[PDB]
mmCIF file of C-alpha atoms and ligand atoms in Angstrom:
data_model
loop_
_atom_site.group_PDB
_atom_site.id
_atom_site.type_symbol
_atom_site.label_atom_id
_atom_site.label_comp_id
_atom_site.label_asym_id
_atom_site.label_seq_id
_atom_site.Cartn_x
_atom_site.Cartn_y
_atom_site.Cartn_z
ATOM 1 C CA UNK A 4 89.568 -39.630 -31.266
ATOM 2 C CA UNK A 5 87.573 -41.196 -28.800
ATOM 3 C CA UNK A 6 83.589 -41.360 -29.967
ATOM 4 C CA UNK A 7 83.195 -39.839 -26.372
ATOM 5 C CA UNK A 8 85.343 -36.627 -27.484
ATOM 6 C CA UNK A 9 83.794 -36.658 -31.103
ATOM 7 C CA UNK A 10 79.933 -36.213 -29.152
ATOM 8 C CA UNK A 11 81.112 -33.092 -27.393
ATOM 9 C CA UNK A 12 82.787 -31.327 -29.769
ATOM 10 C CA UNK A 13 80.203 -32.290 -32.493
ATOM 11 C CA UNK A 14 76.907 -31.350 -30.143
ATOM 12 C CA UNK A 15 75.688 -28.271 -28.920
ATOM 13 C CA UNK A 16 76.555 -28.683 -24.659
ATOM 14 C CA UNK A 17 72.894 -27.856 -24.131
ATOM 15 C CA UNK A 18 72.079 -31.426 -25.644
ATOM 16 C CA UNK A 19 75.214 -32.857 -24.544
ATOM 17 C CA UNK A 20 74.084 -32.120 -21.140
ATOM 18 C CA UNK A 21 70.339 -33.308 -21.536
ATOM 19 C CA UNK A 22 71.915 -36.427 -22.854
ATOM 20 C CA UNK A 23 74.321 -37.169 -20.335
ATOM 21 C CA UNK A 24 71.669 -36.768 -17.148
ATOM 22 C CA UNK A 25 69.626 -39.188 -19.538
ATOM 23 C CA UNK A 26 71.756 -41.926 -19.610
ATOM 24 C CA UNK A 27 73.093 -41.646 -15.557
ATOM 25 C CA UNK A 28 69.410 -41.271 -14.795
ATOM 26 C CA UNK A 29 68.651 -44.767 -16.415
ATOM 27 C CA UNK A 30 71.542 -46.323 -15.227
ATOM 28 C CA UNK A 31 73.717 -45.890 -18.131
ATOM 29 C CA UNK A 32 77.339 -44.544 -18.344
ATOM 30 C CA UNK A 33 78.162 -42.196 -21.684
ATOM 31 C CA UNK A 34 81.850 -43.028 -20.811
ATOM 32 C CA UNK A 35 80.549 -46.631 -21.897
ATOM 33 C CA UNK A 36 77.834 -46.499 -23.943
ATOM 34 C CA UNK A 37 79.434 -43.763 -26.529
ATOM 35 C CA UNK A 38 77.550 -45.137 -29.065
ATOM 36 C CA UNK A 39 74.180 -44.633 -27.463
ATOM 37 C CA UNK A 40 75.711 -41.354 -25.873
ATOM 38 C CA UNK A 41 75.925 -40.383 -30.060
ATOM 39 C CA UNK A 42 72.476 -41.509 -30.814
ATOM 40 C CA UNK A 43 70.861 -39.739 -27.799
ATOM 41 C CA UNK A 44 72.256 -36.712 -28.978
ATOM 42 C CA UNK A 45 71.596 -36.846 -32.104
ATOM 43 C CA UNK A 46 67.766 -37.519 -31.991
ATOM 44 C CA UNK A 47 67.542 -35.181 -29.467
ATOM 45 C CA UNK A 48 69.351 -32.749 -32.403
ATOM 46 C CA UNK A 49 67.081 -33.478 -34.809
ATOM 47 C CA UNK A 50 64.084 -33.026 -32.810
ATOM 48 C CA UNK A 51 65.160 -29.282 -31.929
ATOM 49 C CA UNK A 52 65.812 -28.756 -35.723
ATOM 50 C CA UNK A 53 62.609 -30.000 -36.804
ATOM 51 C CA UNK A 54 61.029 -27.310 -34.688
ATOM 52 C CA UNK A 55 63.729 -24.642 -35.267
ATOM 53 C CA UNK A 56 62.495 -21.649 -37.102
ATOM 54 C CA UNK A 57 59.005 -22.385 -37.943
ATOM 55 C CA UNK A 58 56.182 -20.171 -36.928
ATOM 56 C CA UNK A 59 52.337 -19.775 -37.437
ATOM 57 C CA UNK A 60 51.501 -15.959 -39.196
ATOM 58 C CA UNK A 61 48.312 -14.104 -38.687
ATOM 59 C CA UNK A 62 46.970 -16.527 -41.522
ATOM 60 C CA UNK A 63 47.778 -19.436 -39.385
ATOM 61 C CA UNK A 64 50.061 -20.945 -42.057
ATOM 62 C CA UNK A 65 53.006 -22.258 -41.748
ATOM 63 C CA UNK A 66 56.248 -19.595 -41.881
ATOM 64 C CA UNK A 67 60.113 -19.875 -41.581
ATOM 65 C CA UNK A 68 61.796 -17.406 -40.004
ATOM 66 C CA UNK A 69 65.761 -16.904 -39.094
ATOM 67 C CA UNK A 70 62.587 -16.942 -28.048
ATOM 68 C CA UNK A 71 61.239 -13.285 -29.355
ATOM 69 C CA UNK A 72 58.980 -14.636 -31.580
ATOM 70 C CA UNK A 73 55.999 -16.574 -29.492
ATOM 71 C CA UNK A 74 53.653 -18.561 -32.198
ATOM 72 C CA UNK A 75 55.522 -21.684 -32.750
ATOM 73 C CA UNK A 76 54.392 -24.188 -34.948
ATOM 74 C CA UNK A 77 55.489 -27.381 -32.613
ATOM 75 C CA UNK A 78 55.643 -27.471 -28.807
ATOM 76 C CA UNK A 79 58.875 -29.547 -27.949
ATOM 77 C CA UNK A 80 57.826 -32.768 -25.842
ATOM 78 C CA UNK A 81 61.528 -34.911 -26.109
ATOM 79 C CA UNK A 82 64.158 -33.647 -23.630
ATOM 80 C CA UNK A 83 61.557 -32.545 -20.988
ATOM 81 C CA UNK A 84 61.765 -35.047 -17.715
ATOM 82 C CA UNK A 85 58.422 -37.326 -17.978
ATOM 83 C CA UNK A 86 56.348 -34.974 -15.309
ATOM 84 C CA UNK A 87 56.673 -32.076 -17.555
ATOM 85 C CA UNK A 88 56.472 -33.665 -20.624
ATOM 86 C CA UNK A 89 53.360 -35.405 -19.206
ATOM 87 C CA UNK A 90 51.756 -31.949 -18.271
ATOM 88 C CA UNK A 91 52.445 -30.658 -21.650
ATOM 89 C CA UNK A 92 50.762 -33.263 -23.198
ATOM 90 C CA UNK A 93 47.473 -32.804 -21.099
ATOM 91 C CA UNK A 94 47.241 -29.067 -21.675
ATOM 92 C CA UNK A 95 47.748 -29.922 -25.427
ATOM 93 C CA UNK A 96 44.829 -32.391 -25.194
ATOM 94 C CA UNK A 97 42.879 -30.077 -22.724
ATOM 95 C CA UNK A 98 43.034 -26.893 -24.715
ATOM 96 C CA UNK A 99 43.269 -28.902 -29.024
ATOM 97 C CA UNK A 100 41.085 -31.480 -27.816
ATOM 98 C CA UNK A 101 43.239 -34.298 -29.898
ATOM 99 C CA UNK A 102 43.470 -37.853 -28.097
ATOM 100 C CA UNK A 103 45.855 -38.610 -25.563
ATOM 101 C CA UNK A 104 48.723 -40.284 -26.825
ATOM 102 C CA UNK A 105 49.550 -43.536 -24.682
ATOM 103 C CA UNK A 106 53.242 -43.024 -25.033
ATOM 104 C CA UNK A 107 55.256 -39.816 -24.802
ATOM 105 C CA UNK A 108 55.514 -38.297 -28.917
ATOM 106 C CA UNK A 109 58.502 -36.077 -29.541
ATOM 107 C CA UNK A 110 56.455 -32.712 -30.703
ATOM 108 C CA UNK A 111 52.997 -31.252 -31.169
ATOM 109 C CA UNK A 112 52.398 -29.725 -34.187
ATOM 110 C CA UNK A 113 49.993 -27.001 -33.488
ATOM 111 C CA UNK A 114 49.021 -26.659 -37.749
ATOM 112 C CA UNK A 115 48.015 -30.248 -38.355
ATOM 113 C CA UNK A 116 46.874 -30.427 -34.664
ATOM 114 C CA UNK A 117 48.622 -34.399 -34.365
ATOM 115 C CA UNK A 118 51.637 -35.482 -32.271
ATOM 116 C CA UNK A 119 54.860 -36.408 -34.416
ATOM 117 C CA UNK A 120 57.113 -39.282 -33.332
ATOM 118 C CA UNK A 121 60.848 -38.587 -34.786
ATOM 119 C CA UNK A 122 63.166 -41.341 -35.332
ATOM 120 C CA UNK A 123 66.829 -41.105 -36.723
ATOM 121 C CA UNK A 124 68.172 -44.689 -37.990
ATOM 122 C CA UNK A 125 71.675 -45.944 -39.516
ATOM 123 C CA UNK A 126 69.278 -49.332 -40.468
ATOM 124 C CA UNK A 127 66.978 -49.313 -43.008
ATOM 125 C CA UNK A 128 64.262 -47.103 -42.634
ATOM 126 C CA UNK A 129 61.329 -49.408 -42.519
ATOM 127 C CA UNK A 130 62.872 -50.796 -39.668
ATOM 128 C CA UNK A 131 62.597 -47.957 -36.842
ATOM 129 C CA UNK A 132 59.203 -46.921 -38.593
ATOM 130 C CA UNK A 133 58.005 -50.668 -37.912
ATOM 131 C CA UNK A 134 59.034 -50.937 -34.241
ATOM 132 C CA UNK A 135 57.312 -47.480 -33.576
ATOM 133 C CA UNK A 136 54.213 -48.302 -35.529
ATOM 134 C CA UNK A 137 53.429 -51.559 -33.446
ATOM 135 C CA UNK A 138 53.752 -49.354 -30.105
ATOM 136 C CA UNK A 139 51.655 -46.559 -31.282
ATOM 137 C CA UNK A 140 49.092 -48.913 -32.941
ATOM 138 C CA UNK A 141 47.189 -44.778 -33.600
ATOM 139 C CA UNK A 142 46.756 -40.693 -34.296
ATOM 140 C CA UNK A 143 50.493 -40.206 -33.540
ATOM 141 C CA UNK A 144 52.172 -39.053 -36.720
ATOM 142 C CA UNK A 145 56.021 -40.865 -37.450
ATOM 143 C CA UNK A 146 58.670 -39.337 -39.514
ATOM 144 C CA UNK A 147 62.089 -41.401 -39.741
ATOM 145 C CA UNK A 148 65.247 -40.059 -40.795
ATOM 146 C CA UNK A 149 68.265 -41.945 -42.220
ATOM 147 C CA UNK A 150 71.849 -41.222 -42.502
ATOM 148 C CA UNK A 151 71.574 -41.974 -46.299
ATOM 149 C CA UNK A 152 69.399 -39.249 -47.153
ATOM 150 C CA UNK A 153 65.715 -41.628 -47.108
ATOM 151 C CA UNK A 154 62.636 -40.768 -45.050
ATOM 152 C CA UNK A 155 59.972 -42.290 -44.580
ATOM 153 C CA UNK A 156 57.011 -40.578 -42.713
ATOM 154 C CA UNK A 157 53.312 -41.869 -42.002
ATOM 155 C CA UNK A 158 51.374 -41.705 -45.473
ATOM 156 C CA UNK A 159 54.233 -40.451 -46.958
ATOM 157 C CA UNK A 160 53.213 -36.791 -45.512
ATOM 158 C CA UNK A 161 56.485 -34.762 -44.516
ATOM 159 C CA UNK A 162 55.302 -32.264 -42.847
ATOM 160 C CA UNK A 163 58.377 -30.216 -43.377
ATOM 161 C CA UNK A 164 58.931 -28.050 -46.540
ATOM 162 C CA UNK A 165 61.474 -29.557 -48.383
ATOM 163 C CA UNK A 166 64.444 -26.927 -47.577
ATOM 164 C CA UNK A 167 64.083 -27.651 -43.547
ATOM 165 C CA UNK A 168 64.253 -31.559 -44.754
ATOM 166 C CA UNK A 169 67.241 -30.967 -46.778
ATOM 167 C CA UNK A 170 68.930 -29.053 -43.623
ATOM 168 C CA UNK A 171 68.039 -31.991 -41.299
ATOM 169 C CA UNK A 172 69.439 -34.418 -43.897
ATOM 170 C CA UNK A 173 72.330 -32.517 -44.421
ATOM 171 C CA UNK A 174 73.212 -32.083 -40.705
ATOM 172 C CA UNK A 175 73.085 -36.023 -40.633
ATOM 173 C CA UNK A 176 75.298 -36.534 -43.838
ATOM 174 C CA UNK A 177 78.337 -33.923 -42.069
ATOM 175 C CA UNK A 178 77.730 -36.190 -38.420
ATOM 176 C CA UNK A 179 78.140 -39.549 -41.019
ATOM 177 C CA UNK A 180 81.389 -37.950 -43.290
ATOM 178 C CA UNK A 181 83.273 -36.659 -39.845
ATOM 179 C CA UNK A 182 82.504 -40.369 -37.726
ATOM 180 C CA UNK A 183 83.692 -41.847 -41.295
ATOM 181 C CA UNK A 184 87.123 -39.658 -41.532
ATOM 182 C CA UNK A 185 87.638 -40.587 -37.617
ATOM 183 C CA UNK A 186 86.958 -44.417 -38.376
ATOM 184 C CA UNK A 187 84.171 -44.074 -35.983
ATOM 185 C CA UNK A 188 81.402 -45.080 -38.457
ATOM 186 C CA UNK A 189 81.493 -48.559 -38.828
ATOM 187 C CA UNK A 190 81.426 -49.213 -35.079
ATOM 188 C CA UNK A 191 78.202 -46.665 -34.831
ATOM 189 C CA UNK A 192 76.001 -48.111 -38.253
ATOM 190 C CA UNK A 193 76.448 -51.340 -36.234
ATOM 191 C CA UNK A 194 75.421 -50.807 -32.311
ATOM 192 C CA UNK A 195 71.798 -49.542 -33.402
ATOM 193 C CA UNK A 196 69.653 -52.145 -32.040
ATOM 194 C CA UNK A 197 65.836 -52.867 -31.628
HETATM 195 O O1 LIG B 202 62.495 -44.432 -29.666
HETATM 196 C C1 LIG B 202 62.527 -42.765 -29.582
HETATM 197 O O2 LIG B 202 62.963 -42.408 -30.956
HETATM 198 C C2 LIG B 202 61.708 -42.093 -28.529
HETATM 199 O O3 LIG B 202 62.023 -41.076 -28.876
HETATM 200 C C3 LIG B 202 61.307 -42.318 -27.660
HETATM 201 C C4 LIG B 202 60.971 -42.058 -26.386
HETATM 202 O O4 LIG B 202 60.862 -40.649 -26.233
HETATM 203 C C5 LIG B 202 60.851 -42.628 -25.146
HETATM 204 C C6 LIG B 202 59.316 -43.516 -24.736
HETATM 205 C C7 LIG B 202 58.722 -43.823 -25.886
HETATM 206 C C8 LIG B 202 58.485 -45.318 -25.666
HETATM 207 C C9 LIG B 202 57.820 -45.739 -26.735
HETATM 208 C C10 LIG B 202 57.600 -45.296 -28.188
HETATM 209 CL CL1 LIG B 202 56.376 -46.387 -29.247
HETATM 210 C C11 LIG B 202 57.534 -43.954 -28.325
HETATM 211 C C12 LIG B 202 58.286 -43.263 -26.922
HETATM 212 C C13 LIG B 202 62.031 -44.024 -25.068
HETATM 213 C C14 LIG B 202 63.185 -43.738 -23.965
HETATM 214 N N1 LIG B 202 63.553 -42.109 -23.513
HETATM 215 C C15 LIG B 202 63.931 -41.897 -23.018
HETATM 216 C C16 LIG B 202 65.879 -42.979 -23.021
HETATM 217 C C17 LIG B 202 67.256 -41.919 -23.057
HETATM 218 C C18 LIG B 202 68.032 -42.591 -22.771
HETATM 219 C C19 LIG B 202 68.008 -43.804 -21.869
HETATM 220 C C20 LIG B 202 66.499 -44.430 -21.703
HETATM 221 C C21 LIG B 202 65.947 -44.193 -21.983
HETATM 222 C C22 LIG B 202 61.886 -41.597 -23.605
HETATM 223 C C23 LIG B 202 60.638 -41.777 -23.408
HETATM 224 MN MN1 LIG B 203 60.684 -39.138 -27.977
HETATM 225 MN MN1 LIG B 204 61.682 -40.389 -31.084
#
């Protein structure tokens, strides 16, 4: 199996289409930078999984419920074009009064009233965390996940319940096991760069 076919069989076609456009528009070919194609899809998938099933009930408390339900706990900013991402961020700042970040985050959490930056790493978790805290310098909460099961989050506050975190980590565990059984893991593990 080529990594390219792996990606197209592993991820939802919606994630794949978004990832393909992002690479071409930035001048990269998903048929050439295949590990980067798989990394883009993975990060996107985790941002969507992170918002999945989370709403805010009548008490303003966080509920899980698995479109038709309109009180979402997170606004998804990743995946949008920059015009619309900045439009959503401004409207959130306009209406909750949080500070406008200088870099685009991945999500807004309406319960804690903060932006969130998500990282998914195959290197030691401190690394992606540092790369991101360097640029945020910083009301933007950071949460990194790894393919080994470790996480690192600002002030050791993981935002989500244990079960949602275990679902993300299970998904990453499966993605690693299936790449490994096809001899793709080693190359993917080595390709991440700072
Ligand atoms: O690094 C992350 O984990 C992450 O979520 C990054 C981002 O959202 C991008 C912006 C960014 C840049 C710096 C920081 Cl600290 C935070 C966000 C980087 C390139 N992204 C687009 C990317 C798609 C593939 C081709 C190259 C550009 C979008 C904005
Ligand atoms: Mn992002
Ligand atoms: Mn991110």
